[PDB]
């Protein structure tokens, strides 16, 4: 292998992952947001922010670095974050080592403008020697031994569906849902509000709650039902009637208990109410009358495959993609999720056999994007990736 | 009786006229390259 | 191909033909054993040509230095006859034999002309063929030589020095 050690940085819209290419896990996972506390001042890091957030001090406000595109939109802040990472976590001059960072799949447009802002940050400001940009869905797929794959990423910003054929990304078939993890935080909060008393500028408390009890609730209460929930209900009812009538147990009546710490208070949901939260990802027409069933994850996956079949047979691409389905993302770890994504895919494409792949290790999908970039950085040849040097920048600067 | 148009002669004529190398190197070269990256990923995971 | 070790026998019958043809510039077929050896050589040569009319057989023939050297020897003798050199002058009492010989050789050349496609600058085949082309009055021979020359220029560059520089304005004008 090569005589080098890279810094690997992944700026997700929710989490930021950083570490060196020479070890199996990242040195740090910190929030892709910061507190601006006021003479201004910028707080980064999971415990630093949760401490400051709990202080409940006026003028403290949480801002974000990554928009819903998965792309950085506040570049002055991003530099401060990178400085923070290099200074306090990796503890190395940014000038020494090659850098590997990620971008999300796009349709192609915002690409050049981004690349430029990265030149300015990597070169003008940090003095990085050289960097590679890997495309998240692509790296994750490669890290998994796959050159062609339908990559279904369910993160905080929403679902990102990306067909990848023979190492190439099909941009026009790239699809980004708007409903994911962060959406789930909103719904858990709005729904539980009356039991916990509670029912931008108030960003600090929203954030702190999202990062504390709401995060635990998601990891322990929510489940995704295997089949359209409204149907599951009608069925379970229809069956329940017969057990009852017959003599003279509906699974949705099981209760689940969550200790809510801030008030030392038990919150009990029935299994249906637990299934209900993720149902919105699949049938978002159930919150507002302003969402079409087509904004739901099932129709969306289908849409993106069909748009893959338009290249540039279809019942071949369909077959390729569907035998290499990759399910990934923090939110994809919610119990029942893989199976519903599968059921939802299988019924839009009955003629085909689906085979899906997913990291089964809890940690590794939360940071599978970073894991992907890592396996790119450990590729044995410099010729395997585009590596931008200070040169490239100079030459772009000409007219 | 002589065979006026042999198979290999016609094939070579058609090939030369169509040519008048880079494509073969690019296709085969890219396959060799993608394969190396793939064999190597099957190695990192096992490590 | 299906019958290997068939070509060695024909070569054993064909190389003494090379010696005889070298000795063909004077009356030298006085005996009946000489005539028998000559006729066996001619028959083996015709058999080789008839087989070379096929792909596998000509592929096996090309990978043989002896046959190519014999073809070149006969072509250089024909060139010596054509340019009217004083070194080797065919004795007309033997002309008949030589005639048949030449024809078979050219046919062979034609076939193998496809497998020596890029001919370099100082190629003896090309020079022999252009001399014979400028000399002969046969028509079968002219057409065969034209095919052989057009097949020896398949993959050749214009800027790179190739066999096409052995085509003086006399041959092109012809």
UniProtKB/Swiss-Prot annotation, chain A:
Molecular function as annotated in GO: chromatin binding; structural molecule activity
Entry keyword annotation includes Chaperone: no
Effect of residue 344 to K: Impaired heterodimerization with ARP9. Temperature-sensitive phenotype. Moderate suppressor of Ty phenotype
Keyword set, alphabetical order: Chromatin regulator, Nucleus, Transcription, Transcription regulation
Protein localization: Nucleus
Family (UniProt): Belongs to the actin family.
Function text: Component of the chromatin structure remodeling complex (RSC), which is involved in transcription regulation and nucleosome positioning. RSC is responsible for the transfer of a histone octamer from a nucleosome core particle to naked DNA. The reaction requires ATP and involves an activated RSC-nucleosome intermediate. Remodeling reaction also involves DNA translocation, DNA twist and conformational change.
Name assigned to this protein: Actin-related protein 7
Biological source species: Saccharomyces cerevisiae (strain ATCC 204508 / S288c) (Baker's yeast)
This protein's encoding gene: ARP7
Curated annotation (Swiss-Prot), chain B:
Subcellular location: Nucleus
Signal peptide range: none
Highest taxon of source: Eukaryota
Similarity remark: Belongs to the SNF2/RAD54 helicase family.
Entry function: Catalytic component of the chromatin structure-remodeling complex (RSC), which is involved in transcription regulation and nucleosome positioning. RSC is responsible for the transfer of a histone octamer from a nucleosome core particle to naked DNA. The reaction requires ATP and involves an activated RSC-nucleosome intermediate. Remodeling reaction also involves DNA translocation, DNA twist and conformational change.
Self-association and partners: Interacts directly with SFH1, CSE4, histones H3, H4 and H2B, and via its N-terminus, with RSC8. Interacts with LDB7, NPL6 and RTT102. Component of the two forms of the RSC complex composed of at least either RSC1 or RSC2, and ARP7, ARP9, LDB7, NPL6, RSC3, RSC30, RSC4, RSC58, RSC6, RSC8, RSC9, SFH1, STH1, HTL1 and probably RTT102. The complexes interact with histone and histone variant components of centromeric chromatin.
Note: Present with 1990 molecules/cell in log phase SD medium.
Protein name: Nuclear protein STH1/NPS1
Organism expressing this protein natively: Saccharomyces cerevisiae (strain ATCC 204508 / S288c) (Baker's yeast)
Gene: STH1
UniProtKB/Swiss-Prot annotation, chain C:
Compartment annotation: Nucleus
Transmembrane segments annotated in the record for this chain: none
Source organism, top-level taxon: Eukaryota
Other notes: Present with 2610 molecules/cell in log phase SD medium.
Similarity section: Belongs to the RSC9 family.
Oligomer and partners: Component of the two forms of the RSC complex composed of at least either RSC1 or RSC2, and ARP7, ARP9, LDB7, NPL6, RSC3, RSC30, RSC4, RSC58, RSC6, RSC8, RSC9, SFH1, STH1, HTL1 and probably RTT102. The complexes interact with histone and histone variant components of centromeric chromatin.
Role of this protein: Component of the chromatin structure-remodeling complex (RSC), which is involved in transcription regulation and nucleosome positioning. RSC is responsible for the transfer of a histone octamer from a nucleosome core particle to naked DNA. The reaction requires ATP and involves an activated RSC-nucleosome intermediate. Remodeling reaction also involves DNA translocation, DNA twist and conformational change.
Protein name: Chromatin structure-remodeling complex subunit RSC9
Species whose genome carries this gene: Saccharomyces cerevisiae (strain ATCC 204508 / S288c) (Baker's yeast)
């Amino acid at each position: 292998t090569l005589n080098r050690k890279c810094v690997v940085i992944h700026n997700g819209s929710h989490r930021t992952v950083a570490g060196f290419s020479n070890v199996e896990l990242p040195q740090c996972i910190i929030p892709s947001s910061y507190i601006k506390r006021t003479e201004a001042e910028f707080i980064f890091g999971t415990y630093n922010m949760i401490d400051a957030a709990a202080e409940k001090r006026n003028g403290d406000e949480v801002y974000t670095l990554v928009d819903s595109q998965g792309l950085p939109y506040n570049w002055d802040a991003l530099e401060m974050q990178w400085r923070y990472l290099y200074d306090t976590q990796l503890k190395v001059s940014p000038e020494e080592l090659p850098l590997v960072i990620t971008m999300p799949a796009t349709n192609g447009k915002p690409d050049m403008a981004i690349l430029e802002r990265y030149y300015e940050l990597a070169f003008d400001k940090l003095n990085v020697p050289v960097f590679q940009i890997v495309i998240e869905p692509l790296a994750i797929a490669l890290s998994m031994g796959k050159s062609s794959a339908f990559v279904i990423d369910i993160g905080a910003s929403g679902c990102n569906v990306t067909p990848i054929i023979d190492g190439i990304v099909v941009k026009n078939a790239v699809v980004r849902s708007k409903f994911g993890g962060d959406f789930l935080d909103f719904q858990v909060h709005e729904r539980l509000a009356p039991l916990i008393k509670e029912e931008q500028k108030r960003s600090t408390d929203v954030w702190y709650e999202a990062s504390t009890w709401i995060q635990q609730f998601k990891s322990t209460m929510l489940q995704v039902s295997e089949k359209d929930l409204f149907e599951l209900e009608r069925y379970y009812k229809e069956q329940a009637d017969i057990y009852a009538k017959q003599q003279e147990n509906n699974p949705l009546v099981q209760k689940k208990n969550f200790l809510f710490k801030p008030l030392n208070k038990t919150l009990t949901l029935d299994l249906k109410e637990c299934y209900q939260f993720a149902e919105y990802l699949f049938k978002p027409q159930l919150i507002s009358d302003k969402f079409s069933p087509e904004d739901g994850l099932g129709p969306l996956m289908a849409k993106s495959v069909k748009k893959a079949g338009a290249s540039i047979s279809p019942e071949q691409v369909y077959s390729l993609l569907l035998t290499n389905v990759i399910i990934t993302g923090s939110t994809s770890l919610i119990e029942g999720m893989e199976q519903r994504i599968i059921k939802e895919l299988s019924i839009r494409f009955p003629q085909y056999k689906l085979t899906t792949f997913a990291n089964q290790v809890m940690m590794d999908r939360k940071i599978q994007g970073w894991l992907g970039a890592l396996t790119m950085a450990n590729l044995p040849s410099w010729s395997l990736g585009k590596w931008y040097s200070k040169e490239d920048y100079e030459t772009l600067k000409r007219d | 009786s002589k065979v006026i148009v042999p198979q290999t002669v016609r094939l070579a004529e058609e090939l030369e006229r169509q040519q008048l190398e880079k494509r073969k190197k690019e296709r085969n070269l890219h396959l060799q390259k993608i394969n190396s990256i793939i064999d190597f990923i099957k190695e990192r995971q096992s490590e | 191909r299906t019958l290997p070790d068939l070509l060695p026998l024909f070569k054993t019958f064909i190389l003494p033909l090379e010696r005889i043809v070298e000795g063909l510039n004077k009356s030298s077929i006085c005996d009946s054993k000489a005539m028998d050896s000559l006729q066996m050589g001619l028959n083996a040569l015709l058999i080789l040509r008839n087989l070379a009319q096929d792909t596998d057989s000509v592929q096996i023939l090309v990978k043989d230095r002896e046959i190519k050297s014999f073809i070149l020897f006969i072509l250089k003798k024909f060139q010596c006859v054509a340019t009217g050199d004083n070194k080797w002058q065919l004795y007309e009492g033997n002309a008949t034999f030589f005639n048949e010989l030449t024809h078979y050789t050219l046919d062979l050349m034609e076939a193998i002309s496809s497998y020596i496609a890029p001919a370099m600058k100082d190629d003896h085949y090309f020079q022999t063929l252009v001399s014979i082309l400028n000399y002969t009055k046969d028509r079968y021979m002219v057409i065969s030589i034209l095919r052989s020359l057009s097949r020896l220029l398949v993959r050749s560059k214009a800027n790179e020095e190739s066999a096409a520089d052995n085509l003086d304005h006399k041959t092109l004008s012809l």
